[PDB]
Amino acid sequence: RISWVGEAVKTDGKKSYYKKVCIDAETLEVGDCVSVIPDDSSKPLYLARVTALWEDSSNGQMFHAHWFCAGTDTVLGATSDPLELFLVDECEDMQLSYIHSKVKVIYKAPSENWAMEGGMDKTYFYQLWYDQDYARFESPPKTQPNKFKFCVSCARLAEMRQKEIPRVLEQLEDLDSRVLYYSATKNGILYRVGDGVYLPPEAFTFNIPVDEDLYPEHYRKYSDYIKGSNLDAPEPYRIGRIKEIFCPKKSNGRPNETDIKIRVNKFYRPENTHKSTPASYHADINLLYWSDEEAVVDFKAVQGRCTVEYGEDLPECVQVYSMGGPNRFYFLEAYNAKSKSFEDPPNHARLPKLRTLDVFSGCGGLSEGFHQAGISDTLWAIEMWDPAAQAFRLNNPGSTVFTEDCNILLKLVMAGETTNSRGQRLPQKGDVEMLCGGPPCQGFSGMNRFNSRTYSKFKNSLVVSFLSYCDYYRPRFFLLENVRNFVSFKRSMVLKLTLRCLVRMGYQCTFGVLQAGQYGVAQTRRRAIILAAAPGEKLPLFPEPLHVFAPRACQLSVVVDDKKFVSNITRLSSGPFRTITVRDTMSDLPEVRNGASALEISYNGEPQSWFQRQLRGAQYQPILRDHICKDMSALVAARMRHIPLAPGSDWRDLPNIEVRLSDGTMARKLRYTHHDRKNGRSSSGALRGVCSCVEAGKACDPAARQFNTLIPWCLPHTGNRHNHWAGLYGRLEWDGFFSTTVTNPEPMGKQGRVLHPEQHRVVSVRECARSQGFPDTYRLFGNILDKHRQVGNAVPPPLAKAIGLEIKLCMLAKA
DNA sequence: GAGGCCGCCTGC
DNA sequence: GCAGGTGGCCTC
Ligand SMILES: Nc1ncnc2c1ncn2[C@@H]1O[C@H](CSCC[C@H](N)C(=O)O)[C@@H](O)[C@H]1O
Numbered sequence: 001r002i003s004w005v006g007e008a009v010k011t012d013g014k015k016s017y018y019k020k021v022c023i024d025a026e027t028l029e030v031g032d033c034v035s036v037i038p039d040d041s042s043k044p045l046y047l048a049r050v051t052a053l054w055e056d057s058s059n060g061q062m063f064h065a066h067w068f069c070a071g072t073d074t075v076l077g078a079t080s081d082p083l084e085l086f087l088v089d090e091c092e093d094m095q096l097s098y099i100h101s102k103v104k105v106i107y108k109a110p111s112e113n114w115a116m117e118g119g120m121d122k123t124y125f126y127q128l129w130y131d132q133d134y135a136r137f138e139s140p141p142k143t144q145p146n147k148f149k150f151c152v153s154c155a156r157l158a159e160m161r162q163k164e165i166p167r168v169l170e171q172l173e174d175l176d177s178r179v180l181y182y183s184a185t186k187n188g189i190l191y192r193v194g195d196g197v198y199l200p201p202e203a204f205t206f207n208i209p210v211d212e213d214l215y216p217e218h219y220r221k222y223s224d225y226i227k228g229s230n231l232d233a234p235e236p237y238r239i240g241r242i243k244e245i246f247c248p249k250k251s252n253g254r255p256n257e258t259d260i261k262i263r264v265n266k267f268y269r270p271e272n273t274h275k276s277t278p279a280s281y282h283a284d285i286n287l288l289y290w291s292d293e294e295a296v297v298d299f300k301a302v303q304g305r306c307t308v309e310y311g312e313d314l315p316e317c318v319q320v321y322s323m324g325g326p327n328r329f330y331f332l333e334a335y336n337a338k339s340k341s342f343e344d345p346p347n348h349a350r351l352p353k354l355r356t357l358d359v360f361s362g363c364g365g366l367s368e369g370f371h372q373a374g375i376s377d378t379l380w381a382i383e384m385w386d387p388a389a390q391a392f393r394l395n396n397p398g399s400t401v402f403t404e405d406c407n408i409l410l411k412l413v414m415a416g417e418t419t420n421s422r423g424q425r426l427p428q429k430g431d432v433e434m435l436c437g438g439p440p441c442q443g444f445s446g447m448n449r450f451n452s453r454t455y456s457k458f459k460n461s462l463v464v465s466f467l468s469y470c471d472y473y474r475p476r477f478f479l480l481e482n483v484r485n486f487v488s489f490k491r492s493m494v495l496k497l498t499l500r501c502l503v504r505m506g507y508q509c510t511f512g513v514l515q516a517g518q519y520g521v522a523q524t525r526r527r528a529i530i531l532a533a534a535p536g537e538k539l540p541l542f543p544e545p546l547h548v549f550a551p552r553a554c555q556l557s558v559v560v561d562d563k564k565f566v567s568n569i570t571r572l573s574s575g576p577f578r579t580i581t582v583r584d585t586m587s588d589l590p591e592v593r594n595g596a597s598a599l600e601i602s603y604n605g606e607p608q609s610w611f612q613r614q615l616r617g618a619q620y621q622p623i624l625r626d627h628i629c630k631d632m633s634a635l636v637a638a639r640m641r642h643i644p645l646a647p648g649s650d651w652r653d654l655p656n657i658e659v660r661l662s663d664g665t666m667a668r669k670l671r672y673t674h675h676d677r678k679n680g681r682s683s684s685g686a687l688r689g690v691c692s693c694v695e696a697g698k699a700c701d702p703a704a705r706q707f708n709t710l711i712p713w714c715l716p717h718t719g720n721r722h723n724h725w726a727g728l729y730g731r732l733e734w735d736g737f738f739s740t741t742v743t744n745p746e747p748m749g750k751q752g753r754v755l756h757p758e759q760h761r762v763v764s765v766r767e768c769a770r771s772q773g774f775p776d777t778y779r780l781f782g783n784i785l786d787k788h789r790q791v792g793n794a795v796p797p798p799l800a801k802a803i804g805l806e807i808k809l810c811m812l813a814k815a
Numbered sequence: 816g817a818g819g820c821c822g823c824c825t826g827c
Numbered sequence: 828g829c830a831g832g833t834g835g836c837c838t839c
């Protein structure tokens with residue numbers, strides 16, 4: 001049968017504990033690993049570590065099973081090592097009758113000389129702990145012993161439970177109906193009387209028909225959807241100052257400490273006063289107004305903690321305070337809602353950087369963000385394209401910039417070479433502490449029709465070149481950025497093989513999708529991010545959103561092999577700061593014409609928004625650089641001049657007129673040869689089809705093509721299968737956001753919403769840089785198309801900065 | 816170079 | 828059907 005080895009060690013109620021057991025041949029101990037056959041006989045064997053052995057008074061002999069995770073059930077899937085398992089926080093008590101056999105598993109700890117093992121290329125083994133929800137591989141926790149029957153998974157799942165439960169800490173006074181407290185804790189955050197709190201926007205309230213003859217293609221706007229619009233963006237958090245923490249005293253009288261309430265003073269954002277949304281235009285994004293309005297909410301509703309300080313009692317200035325920490329707000333005046341006026345507030349309101357190598361550096365958007373975060377000095381940068389190399393050099397005088405193929409340069413280092421052919425010193429093992437880069441996006445971009453032409457192999461891709469840098473140099477931290485489609489390209493195989501390489505090297509790693517607009521730009525730009533960290537390090541979290549942003553642009557979850565993954569991000573429906581708009585981004589720039597080429601002009605005025613104050617910098621700038629526009633042809637310029645200024649205007653609003661051009665001498669009038677039965681006809685009975693495509697799908701006749709037309713011919717030609725080419729020749733809206741900033745803004749590109757909100761022209765280089773969050777002092781290089789490409793390829797610095805601050809926490813938390 | 820032209824997949 | 832895709836090729 002199954003008899004016990006020895007006697008009992010613990011006496012706990014209906015369970016008699018033991019230390020070791022014997023099942024028919026085999027002595028079994030705690031710490032031993034076993035196998036368990038599943039109920040589904042088709043499924044493979046289950047594996048676990050034994051952490052407890054006991055006997056119940058009603059049921060048979062029991063044991064506690066800390067489950068292992070097979071690699072094939074992680075995000076790796078079929079690319080996993082068959083013998084690799086991963087620790088997880090899953091466990092359960094089971095009958096000893098379920099144990100099939102004892103199995104040996106080894107722990108493959110990284111070597112003490114792991115950072116030098118790079119470049120040199122029948123038993124279960126594990127090296128990493130896995131999180132099934134966030135696709136995180138991490139070093140095994142160090143939760144020591146809960147002395148004998150110490151399950152690792154139980155210890156931290158309970159520690160996670162206490163961390164998440166709202167608890168009061170220090171009583172302050174026992175009143176008639178409530179018990180006042182001085183402090184409370186929640187999700188690891190300590191709240192005390194006087195602190196600031198984030199609250200959901202619903203926590204409390206405050207005390208305050210077209211003439212189809214001339215515009216024929218107007219019918220194609222039946223969708224009534226406006227790309228770039230900010231009508232459905234959520235409100236930012238409510239902010240309040242804790243006045244009381246308290247619990248209902250029961251009918252007996254002791255406090256019910258499971259039902260914690262807080263009373264707060266309401267803070268007004270500028271846009272919450274009688275001066276509505278326009279009040280936000282010029283104000284700092286973290287300016288508040290004190291108010292004497294109070295509100296009671298449940299402690300559970302608190303979304304986080306913030307600092308709200310009286311402005312004039314701060315020892316440093318307001319800019320040094322605002323730039324020196326997260327979640328920092330300030331106030332100067334108070335708001336009297338009934339008086340609708342502003343009064344003075346009452347009296348009762350008063351690490352050394354990492355040496356970084358930037359591969360595919362571009363002009364340096366990613367490196368600039370990491371520098372702003374204060375974590376890195378990019379001492380080496382590799383960039384094959386000379387104009388972008390030169391841009392990087394102008395902004396980073398202490399950096400060694402290699403205008404080199406990254407493949408060639410790594411081959412040189414691996415062969416023992418100390419310098420490149422220019423005489424520049426090559427980084428060696430030990431020099432590189434951080435490795436970051438965005439490989440070209442163009443092979444993964446969904447707009448690329450012809451990705452099926454040249455690049456087919458993964459072994460020969462720049463992504464693998466980049467991982468070879470990681471393997472060779474073995475940096476403390478690693479970052480790879482790309483377009484969102486990187487996670488889904490080739491049924492997610494590229495994502496899975498990248499993560500597979502990292503764990504094979506011994507790296508902790510993870511991946512996620514981030515929306516740049518949630519970190520401080522007026523732009524929808526969803527980017528995939530792989531983070532990795534060396535074994536002795538802490539793996540960074542993805543940064544919590546700072547700005548609210550339109551929900552349709554914030555779909556960040558990723559399906560891989562019928563398993564949905566999300567990142568650690570918990571701010572899903574609100575955030576501390578309002579959204580950044582096209583107005584915030586470029587309302588201060590002077591008017592220029594189509595084809596403006598003056599490289600250095602006057603600003604003609606001071607910065608207007610917080611965002612412009614931040615990007616123009618503290619030091620006075622007498623000259624505005626690179627506010628230059630592509631010189632569009634007479635036809636295209638004539639098209640832009642008749643795109644209405646109203647929000648949502650694009651090619652579909654173009655009049656059907658002939659127009660004399662500046663230097664094209666005439667633009668022809670497109671007319672509807674054949675009929676579209678799907679779309680019908682307009683008030684006049686006009687055909688509504690422009691080619692032989694729209695009848696029965698037969699073929700295009702070249703006679704139906706109409707050259708040099710004002711309404712471009714190719715857009716009605718294929719609009720029915722392209723959603724009416726929405727956005728092409730489209731204007732931005734002052735209250736909206738940019739669509740994705742691309743390398744060459746052109747009104748008939750797929751991302752065609754490139755027209756200025758008021759001027760008859762494509763957005764300038766400076767405006768594109770502003771949409772990416774570049775400081776106005778950030779140097780670009782080359783002709784105007786070179787400059788557009790450097791900006792369009794770049795990681796927005798505010799996004800890179802947010803990621804970098806997460807890396808900073810890991811630098812501080814290690815030692 | 817400048818511009819016109821414009822597939823296919825994902826996710827809903 | 829709708830909405831989104833740091834775009835590329837081909838012809839002048
Ligand atoms: N084989 C190669 N070696 C080095 N750089 C390369 C390369 N192939 C392409 N590149 C460069 O890689 C870059 C990808 S775009 C990267 C932009 C950068 N992350 C920023 O924030 O500015 C392009 O600038 C391209 O010129």
Ligand SMILES: [Zn+2]
Binds near residue numbers: 151
């Ligand atoms: Zn357990």
Ligand SMILES: [Zn+2]
Binds near residue numbers: 699717
């Ligand atoms: Zn046709």
